[PDB]
Amino acid sequence: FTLIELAIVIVIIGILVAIAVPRFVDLTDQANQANVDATAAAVRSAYAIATVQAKGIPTCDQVFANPEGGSTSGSTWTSSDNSTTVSCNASADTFTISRGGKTRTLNLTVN
Amino acid sequence: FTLIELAIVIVIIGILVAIAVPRFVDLTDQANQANVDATAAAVRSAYAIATVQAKGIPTCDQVFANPEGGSTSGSTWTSSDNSTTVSCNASADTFTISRGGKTRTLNLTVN
Amino acid sequence: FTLIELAIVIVIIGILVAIAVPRFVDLTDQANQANVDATAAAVRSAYAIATVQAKGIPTCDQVFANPEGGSTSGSTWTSSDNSTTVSCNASADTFTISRGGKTRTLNLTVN
Amino acid sequence: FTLIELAIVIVIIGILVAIAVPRFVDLTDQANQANVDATAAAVRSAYAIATVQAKGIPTCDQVFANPEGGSTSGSTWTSSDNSTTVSCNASADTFTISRGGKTRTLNLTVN
Amino acid sequence: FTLIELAIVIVIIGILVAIAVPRFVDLTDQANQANVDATAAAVRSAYAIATVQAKGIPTCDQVFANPEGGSTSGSTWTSSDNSTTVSCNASADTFTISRGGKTRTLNLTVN
Amino acid sequence: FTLIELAIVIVIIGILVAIAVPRFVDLTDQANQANVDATAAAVRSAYAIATVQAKGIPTCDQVFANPEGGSTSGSTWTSSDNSTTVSCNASADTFTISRGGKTRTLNLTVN
Amino acid sequence: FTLIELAIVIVIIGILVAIAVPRFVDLTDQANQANVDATAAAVRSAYAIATVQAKGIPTCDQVFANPEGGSTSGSTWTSSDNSTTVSCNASADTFTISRGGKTRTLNLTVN
Amino acid sequence: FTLIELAIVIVIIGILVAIAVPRFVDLTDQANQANVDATAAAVRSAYAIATVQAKGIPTCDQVFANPEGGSTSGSTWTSSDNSTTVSCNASADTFTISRGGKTRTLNLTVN
Amino acid sequence: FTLIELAIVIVIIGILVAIAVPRFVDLTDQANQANVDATAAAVRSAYAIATVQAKGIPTCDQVFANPEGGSTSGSTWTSSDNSTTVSCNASADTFTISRGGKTRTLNLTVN
Amino acid sequence: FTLIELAIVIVIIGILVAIAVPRFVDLTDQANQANVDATAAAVRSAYAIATVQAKGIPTCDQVFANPEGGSTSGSTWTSSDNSTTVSCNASADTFTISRGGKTRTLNLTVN
Amino acid sequence: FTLIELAIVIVIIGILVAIAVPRFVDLTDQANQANVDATAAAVRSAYAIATVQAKGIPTCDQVFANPEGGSTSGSTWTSSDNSTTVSCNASADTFTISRGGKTRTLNLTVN
Amino acid sequence: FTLIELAIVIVIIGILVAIAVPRFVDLTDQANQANVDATAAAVRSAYAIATVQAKGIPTCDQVFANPEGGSTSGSTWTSSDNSTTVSCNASADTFTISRGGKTRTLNLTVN
Amino acid sequence: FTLIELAIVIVIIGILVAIAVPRFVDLTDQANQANVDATAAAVRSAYAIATVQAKGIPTCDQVFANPEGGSTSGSTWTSSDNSTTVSCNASADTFTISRGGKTRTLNLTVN
Amino acid sequence: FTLIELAIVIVIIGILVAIAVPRFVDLTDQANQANVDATAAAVRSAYAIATVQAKGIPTCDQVFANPEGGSTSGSTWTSSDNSTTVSCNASADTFTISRGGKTRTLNLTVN
Amino acid sequence: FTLIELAIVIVIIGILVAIAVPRFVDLTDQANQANVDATAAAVRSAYAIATVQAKGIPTCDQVFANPEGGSTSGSTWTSSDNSTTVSCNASADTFTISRGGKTRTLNLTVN
Amino acid sequence: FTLIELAIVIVIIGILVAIAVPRFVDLTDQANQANVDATAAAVRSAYAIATVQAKGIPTCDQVFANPEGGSTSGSTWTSSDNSTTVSCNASADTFTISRGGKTRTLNLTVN
């Protein structure tokens, strides 16, 4: 390594470490409301399929039979990963999807 | 494409592929019993119109003259698409409508 | 057409094609005996009018002169429509009315 | 509306628009001959009542005095609605009932 | 999957899951009163046919002989599916049709 | 930007651009036959309503008075958007619905 | 939910919400004139039965004794549901049936 | 950092910042017409359910009782998020759905 | 080269080889789970397109017809590069995507 | 300059010109396959945006409207610098990206 | 110092000041185009992050919120050291990065 | 040693100790700013690698896991030799590299 | 040679052998640490080039492929002259450069 | 000159011509290897500068453009004085510096 | 002084003034080329130090700031004694050292 | 001793004491400037060795550690015999050698 070589490296490093570089903006909250919409779209469709199967106002278990990509337990379908609890309450007649703070309550006739 | 951009895409894809999505529940069997009822409703009406035309117990051909949205052959009116064979037998005095397994036999005086 | 609309139509069709609906009971034979009585009532009256005209035991042609609503031929008054042949035989001294199987023979002095 | 929901609606619409459905057979001509008989039955009865009132062969006006459910004019009783003109001609000694093509001429002694 | 593609999907999902979507209103009770009327219409007609057959006040068994689309047992015609029990009581002289709460009692002379 | 950072981006881009990604399958032809069925279902219903209004075999203009979501012209109801020409011909006694190649001819008594 | 999936849903929704769909034409007024005829047919028959019972011109109460499917009060038989008031006036010698605007006055000898 | 390392980074950056990268095309207007169709599909269905409930031409409030995923106020159902005002006017006999410029007017008999 | 020049190079080399320099962290496993999600997102969409094409529960071959950027063989779509085997088994009714250890099983009705 | 000073410089030069020094490994070919992937990722996204704009299978010009950082000509989008010709052929239904030997052909429905 | 010692120094100096010695080639212009590329890479990424935050076409201020290693003023992000002015103009819909003569204009939808 | 020899040495020493000879200019401060740039370049890269590992905003310990050629302690990575303390403060959201007076503060989202 | 000449030489030799004359300070150890730094700088760069070639964590042989000015044997690159053994051990994940006592161990992920 | 003076000169000359006096050791060969190292150090640096200029593997003429203190001819840079021929051969990919027997071959990628 | 003593002095003087005695060979010209080399060696080093200070191509005044043992004036560093004018000309890009006829021109980038 | 012998000695002494005989010219001042140059040459070299040892600007004690042939005291190296005081002053940044009137001040960076 000569003296002149390092001098030229000092020049180049000054330029090449003097650039715009973007940072990690956390956009989970943005995607969570997108997720909770997309889930809520399926919950409507699943309910509409349950009504053809049940030929009447379907039960909350019959509604969660239709969605896939996540398991059920009692009366709360959660996604494959532990989020998006679409919890209903047949007495109240309403589903409520909630990814991670961002939520979306929808009211359908369940018994 | 920067490193930080892909990192943010890895975050978003995790969320947006973690939703309820409904599946194709086959509800043909449900609609077939609805079809075979709706057809059987018309077969009653068609028979009642045949009785005014014939001024008496009408023949099985006179009964299939009245329904539309499907062709006849001998003594079996089938729908436009090949289903819903409302087959009678004048000796037995009964029509029998059958969409695709789901069926509905009705007994009227035919000669 | 939405999914929910057809589901509701499937419910309604099940109910509205689940009713009592009466059938064509052939009651011609019942009316034929009623007809042959009503005709026989007139044949008595017509004979009684013939006796005042003829001032004696009337001929079989004089008796069929009185009834109306049907033509004569030789010695058999038939109705307007081809039924109810009230045929007499002056040698046997008896009329016989017959609509369509159901019959009613009456014996009066004819020459 | 999800993609899967419409796909299921496409299946159901195919089935539920594939049924026998009866058509309007025009049976006026059938009922017109029934009407003209029922009217002709009353014209006989009305004439028989006129003969007790008149104590003799009754006039054509005296005969139309008895029927109801329709007005007279000169010598033609028409029904409430403009049909069923039972027109007589006392010179010819015959009534003729005519609903709408289907007719029934009856011959009684009128003066 | 690029970052910009998911961003556009987040926009579209917001719009396409923001629509009116109708719910399953249970209209069985509406159709039950329609059913019980349509059945009661047939029970009148069947009784009127029984009176021509019986030439008098008909028995309760003779009345249920005429309707079709459902079986009898003792003195209660039920529809094909277990509903619409048109039960009479010859001592009380009245039929009573009842689909599923919605009912229609009619009083005819039965022996 | 260091050398090692780009090397890691080269690794990630290889993986993240190596996925299944679905393509636009044109399913208009599928929906056109679904449309032409749904339209044909309404044309039947509209005709049945026209028969109650007209108390007889209705005219082709009276039939197109009932459907909505599209304009008429002479004797061809087209949808709001220029498709689904349900064209009749009263002389031939048949309607014919046609979305965009996929068609459905139905024959009812029109004058 | 991928971008391509929603794009295909946008195509399908355009087609499936572009159909003829019939509207509720109010045909009560049509059925009211049919009702008031059918009621008026029974009022004639009931009067004819009253004349055999009374062996003479029957009273207005004796005439309303015969019809069923509705109650009486003073001198006005109304149907089970509050409509179709067949009101007579023995002084005027005429019944008048009126469902709901559509009416039918008939004149018979009542005392 | 050696001189040769930066030289190689200068080569790589030239290549890796020389790619196609897609831009955000605003497709709200596309989805708004899809939304306003999907909403208009439900408004038809909701009206058809209102007609079974009301057993007649339903009121504008009865029609907005059926849709879900958004609130009402007076006579204008808006979606959960402030868009898609399906405003009717019972005097004019027409609903009008409007997402955000893209609109869809439909005419049904409302009182 | 003077003595003083090398002395100054000895000073500079000490400083310029005394810096933080990042190392290659292997983030394939991170991208593999991102890949297997993105692939699984497409497999859902492709299945939903297959259901519109097949108008029913689609076959496993019809589902792999839709994805692009990789070839099929028998019943296993692999990516362009040999990874991401989305293997189904129609008897078991489930797809399973697997990039390179990181996997994602999804259950849809396949025949 | 003394004799001893140069002797010490002869010692130092021997050591300081006896080091590992890395060479320019040409890694363009490595970055070209990374480039052609990153470009191909955008071509997929751009096509998916074209499908929402075109509401159907988009033209090859509509697809190249979306990418940026390079110009188009006829039917070949090239980057800002003359490389990465993503050339399609609508008849063949396939794009082909090629940086500089390293290439990546992808098949989408273009018209 | 002897005579012979200096004579030997005269020999050595002749050799040791007879070598290749490299000169300072100014390679700022080379690094400036590398810088302006690396900055332009970040400006793309920052814009793509702004689109997820803004859920739409982002403003020019929202885009400069994401890059780091330099300050903003009005509508021109400059690096920490006074160079690399990535100046946009929302009316023209294009960013332009310029290190020091070497520049790179990129066109994205900004409002 | 002769007199003439020393006289010649006196001449030569006058010339050979009459030359330009360069001095030690301390250029540590120059290299320190070059060092603190090169370190700051790695701190950016290390942070970008931490974001892929952490799939989110990474912790300050996860960021110092990636750089090499120096040890950590608590929350301050120092070089192998005791200099270049890149100290962060997760509460303040900023790293600060400092070789020996010459410093470089950079602000990234750390938690 | 005269007496006075030697006397003057005795004077001059006293002065000219009474000077500062510098000694050979052994500065190999100083240059060895400079060498081992300069070598270690190249070993970092060579590793960073190996990572682009290998597209992953490179092998120890791939790393020694890049440096020049010295030969390899098994897993130890030595300089042209027998010194500066940069020996790695892939199991331990660390290179160690050692000129001649003065050493410099660096830890990078090698397999 | 006295006798005693010369006698004393004979004594002194004996002493003053009885001393150590060093001889000319030819140390060109020592300096030639020092020269050929110092030249080879510059040839490395010059090559590293050529790579930034050429942005790739530089030509042999571009490499000899950087060194100074000597002329070029075809493909052999010689020093100002006719020695130190650093001759390359781009086909063989290696420079070779040679002062005067003592040589130093170095292998770099030249084209 | 005896006769014999002088005779012996005559003998000795003959011998002692019959010796080789060296002459003053002027070797300034030899040392001037050695000087102008040693000065030129420093001018190279001083320029290399100026490039680290200036972080770029240094000015001619910055280059003469580094050498010592002589004063400057305008743009010509002369030694302490008036010789060795290393005169540059920034426009021509070359220094020229000249002791006293013997000269040495060297070409470096000066501004 | 004869008379003639002394006469001949008188002749010879006249000749032999009639010669050029050189005198002692004091040339200390000439050698002192030669000494102070030779010492100053070593002081430069010693300083250059101190800079490699100290790896920076060396102290005045470190500089006098290198010369030999004379002792030090505090900050003034004197020769073996008491002359040639090379006295520095670190605050002033300059050495000054002085043999015996004839002096030579040189300015180097000392601390």
Author numbering:
A (entry chain A), B (entry chain F), C (entry chain B), D (entry chain C), E (entry chain E), F (entry chain G), ...: 1 to 111
Task: Show me the paper's own sentences about this structure.
Type IV pili (T4P) are flexible extracellular protein filaments found on many bacteria. They form multifunctional fibres involved in twitching motility, adhesion, immune evasion, bacteriophage infection, virulence and colony formation. Pilins have a conserved N-terminal α-helix, with a 4–5 stranded antiparallel β-sheet at the C-terminus. The α-helix forms the core of the filament, while the globular β-sheet head domain is solvent exposed and subject to post-translational modification.
